[PDB]
Design a protein around this nucleic acid. Structure first.
Length: 240
RNA sequence: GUUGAAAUCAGA
């Protein structure tokens, strides 16, 4: 359960963070890490989600709807997580060696990095999404193939999330989990839409209660829930 | 983890 909090310090003031940063944070960690440990960088780039990171966290903020999130605080925070402590250790080094980050017009500077004290998981957990959760299927639109994104109110959601976690689990943990069952109940739910590169990915910001396989619970906690976790999706905080 | 949240919403 290696999880870090990277602190970011905004150059200048009246700083405005753009709404869609996913691809830019992803590709910048991917390079920084590639310089230090090319071998791990290939894990970060995998479709299978060997790690997750969160929304850029701005504690004191206000919404400017056509521009972005104004940072009224001194600092913002990124939370990176992974079940593999080699990945976490490499990201921490690489980011320290190349502390500059550019997002849109803005530029940050990596401040203190902190390992995070992690509460233990029970039989039943209440999770909250730090980055939205993505579950995709495929559909024909006319003569074209389309990503079609699912939300928890969709009938196929639970079915596809099970399948994606079991599949992800086997690839990154190496074997299938002994216990393949779980159910989740949605407490609070909001839809969101991110532009990553050329495309739009839709997902779920949500609070939910998980019940089920202990090995899957702990996998999603560390590597994120759902798909595209590598692009900063599906990361969850644990709560009471 | 002071985000129980953060605009936009099927895209040519």
């Amino acid at each position: 359960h290696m999880r870090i909090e990277v602190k970011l310090l905004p150059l200048k003031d009246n700083p405005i963070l753009p709404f869609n940063y996913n691809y830019e944070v992803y590709s910048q960690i991917l390079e920084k890490v590639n310089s230090i440990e090319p071998t791990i960088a290939k894990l970060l780039s995998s479709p299978h989600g060997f790690w997750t990171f969160s929304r850029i966290i701005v504690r004191k903020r206000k919404i400017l709807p056509d521009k972005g999130i104004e940072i009224l605080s001194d600092d913002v925070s990124l939370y990176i997580s992974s079940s593999n402590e080699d990945i976490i250790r490499a990201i921490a080094e690489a980011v320290e060696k190349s502390p500059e980050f550019k997002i849109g017009e803005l530029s940050f500077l990596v401040g203190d990095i902190k390992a995070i004290k992690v509460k233990e998981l029970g039989k039943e957990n209440v999770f909250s999404t730090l980055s939205p959760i993505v579950v995709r299927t495929v559909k024909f639109e006319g003569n074209k193939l389309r990503h079609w994104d699912l939300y928890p109110h969709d009938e196929l959601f639970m079915d596809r999330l099970r399948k994606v976690m079991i599949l992800r689990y086997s690839e990154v943990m190496g074997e299938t989990p002994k216990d393949r069952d779980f159910t989740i109940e949605v407490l609070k739910f909001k839809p969101t839409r991110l532009m990553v590169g050329s495309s739009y990915i839709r997902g779920s910001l949500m609070v939910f209660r998980y019940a089920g396989s202990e090995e899957i619970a702990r996998f999603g906690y560390e590597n994120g829930f759902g798909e595209k976790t590598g692009l900063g999706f599906g990361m969850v905080k644990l709560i009471e």
